[PDB]
Design an enzyme around this catalytic site. Structure first.
Site, PDB file in Angstrom:
ATOM      1  N   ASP A  15     -89.892  -3.751  47.245  1.00  0.00           N
ATOM      2  CA  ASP A  15     -90.143  -2.557  48.038  1.00  0.00           C
ATOM      3  C   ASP A  15     -88.853  -2.108  48.684  1.00  0.00           C
ATOM      4  O   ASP A  15     -88.095  -2.936  49.206  1.00  0.00           O
ATOM      5  CB  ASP A  15     -91.176  -2.806  49.135  1.00  0.00           C
ATOM      6  N   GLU A  17     -87.539   0.696  51.618  1.00  0.00           N
ATOM      7  CA  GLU A  17     -87.788   1.689  52.645  1.00  0.00           C
ATOM      8  C   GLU A  17     -86.515   2.494  52.826  1.00  0.00           C
ATOM      9  O   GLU A  17     -85.419   1.993  52.565  1.00  0.00           O
ATOM     10  CB  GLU A  17     -88.159   1.012  53.951  1.00  0.00           C
ATOM     11  N   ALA A  18     -86.651   3.752  53.257  1.00  0.00           N
ATOM     12  CA  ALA A  18     -85.503   4.649  53.261  1.00  0.00           C
ATOM     13  C   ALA A  18     -85.648   5.713  54.340  1.00  0.00           C
ATOM     14  O   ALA A  18     -86.588   5.711  55.144  1.00  0.00           O
ATOM     15  CB  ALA A  18     -85.301   5.258  51.877  1.00  0.00           C
ATOM     16  N   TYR A 122     -90.074   6.498  43.142  1.00  0.00           N
ATOM     17  CA  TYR A 122     -89.354   6.262  44.378  1.00  0.00           C
ATOM     18  C   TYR A 122     -88.414   5.070  44.277  1.00  0.00           C
ATOM     19  O   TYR A 122     -87.203   5.262  44.204  1.00  0.00           O
ATOM     20  CB  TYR A 122     -90.315   6.123  45.565  1.00  0.00           C
ATOM     21  N   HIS A 183     -95.370  -3.260  59.176  1.00  0.00           N
ATOM     22  CA  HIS A 183     -94.669  -2.042  58.793  1.00  0.00           C
ATOM     23  C   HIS A 183     -93.274  -2.375  58.294  1.00  0.00           C
ATOM     24  O   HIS A 183     -92.284  -1.738  58.666  1.00  0.00           O
ATOM     25  CB  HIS A 183     -94.594  -1.080  59.969  1.00  0.00           C
ATOM     26  N   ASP A 188     -95.077  -5.003  52.707  1.00  0.00           N
ATOM     27  CA  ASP A 188     -95.537  -4.245  51.548  1.00  0.00           C
ATOM     28  C   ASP A 188     -95.452  -5.077  50.275  1.00  0.00           C
ATOM     29  O   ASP A 188     -96.335  -4.992  49.413  1.00  0.00           O
ATOM     30  CB  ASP A 188     -94.750  -2.938  51.411  1.00  0.00           C
TER      31      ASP A 188
END
Lengths: 225, 225
Positions: A15, A17-18, A122, A183, A188
């Site tokens: 995973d 995140e960005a 993504y 989070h 994830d």
């Protein structure tokens, strides 16, 4: 072909995140890789409960300082902002990070298959874009990849109104509880692992048939090479 | 000196699991590093409950194939055996692993301080020994280290029959519950983090005063260089 690239030996759940949506030219703020050898999913197997993760796994979770601000929505969702990351001395996406990722993969038997939820739209193009900005446009070319949205759609269709295939929707539909109230990139990935353990042998069959060379992923932005 | 080496910027909590006791010439079977910038412990602060881990952390957990059998006691405690590790394709402690560890450390601001429970007698000399067998006898020389048994003894003495300073004993004495029923390197590191968050500013003062260059750790076995 049932095995265009042979049997995938290690699944590396991923995973990223960005800072924002693809249209914003986003940059990575956090990543997690969780490498599981296929034998942990080579099992013959009331409403089910969440399975425990395999004992033998490799894990890497890193925060990354983007070269730009996080969107308000992104910071709301992830708890990361560029000031927070700077306060903790986080470094940008650089050559050392690329080398770290490759060294982590080199701990795993090949073929390697990255598995990410919505990866095709993504996580995979974003990872390719970050590597492209470093000129490392073939660094991960040895890897294969699959998008677990596509996988789980296939598995649920064979198993049985339209369903959502978001990560949380699948997890709650399968297990009757929401994924741990976390989070983080690691959270994830752990939730994705749990969904992939639902029908693990069927998942491995699908992965072997659909594994795609990572070098065929076009970068979200930046140079192709 | 209060700051022989300046303020330590990143604490890297470390646990190594291995095939047996020091007298057996043990080899690593699992390792976990959890890197926390000091600012996550720079806080002014009924019986306490377990604090949550900081949001911004880097984590690395890896299994390693030793060149020898695990003792029955070791496999009982850790759930790892050499056959299990081989079934998952785990690789030995090699140059790529050493490079991975260094690249992980290079994500962190310096000075780096490794923190391990019983590190002076076990984890630090064992890590030095594994590096020594590869001829990487100065690879981690940039790091500092401290043993959290020594630290927590000092903190509890200032705070207040003889107490045990085993990890589980400290955790249960401070928090009134046992550390999550886990038998992994990652579980031991997370429990150590929690105990280090008990009196975090006092811990940082002690760490700064007692940080020891890793190159002064003699290897458990193997060559010194």
């Amino acid at each position: 072909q049932t095995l265009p690239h042979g049997h995938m030996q290690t699944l590396i759940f991923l995973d990223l995140e960005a800072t924002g949506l693809p249209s914003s030219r986003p940059e990575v703020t956090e990543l997690c890789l969780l490498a599981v050898h296929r034998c942990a999913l080579e099992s013959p197997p009331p409403p089910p409960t969440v399975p425990p993760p395999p004992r033998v796994v490799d894990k890497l979770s890193l925060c990354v300082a983007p070269g730009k601000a996080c969107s308000p929505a992104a910071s709301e969702i992830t708890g990361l902002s560029t000031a927070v990351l700077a306060a903790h001395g986080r470094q940008c996406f650089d050559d050392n990070l690329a080398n770290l990722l490759l060294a982590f993969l080199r701990r795993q038997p090949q073929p390697w298959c990255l598995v990410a939820h919505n990866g095709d739209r993504y996580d995979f193009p974003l990872l390719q874009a970050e590597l492209a900005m470093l000129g490392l446009t073939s660094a991960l070319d040895g890897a294969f990849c699959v998008d677990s949205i596509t996988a789980l759609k296939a598995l649920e269709r064979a198993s049985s109104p339209r369903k959502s295939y978001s990560l949380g929707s699948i997890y709650t539909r399968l297990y009757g509880q929401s994924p741990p109230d976390s989070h983080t990139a690691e959270g994830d990935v752990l939730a994705l692992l749990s969904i992939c353990q639902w029908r693990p042998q069927a998942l491995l069959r699908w992965v072997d048939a659909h594994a795609r060379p990572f070098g065929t992923i076009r970068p979200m932005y930046g140079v192709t090479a």
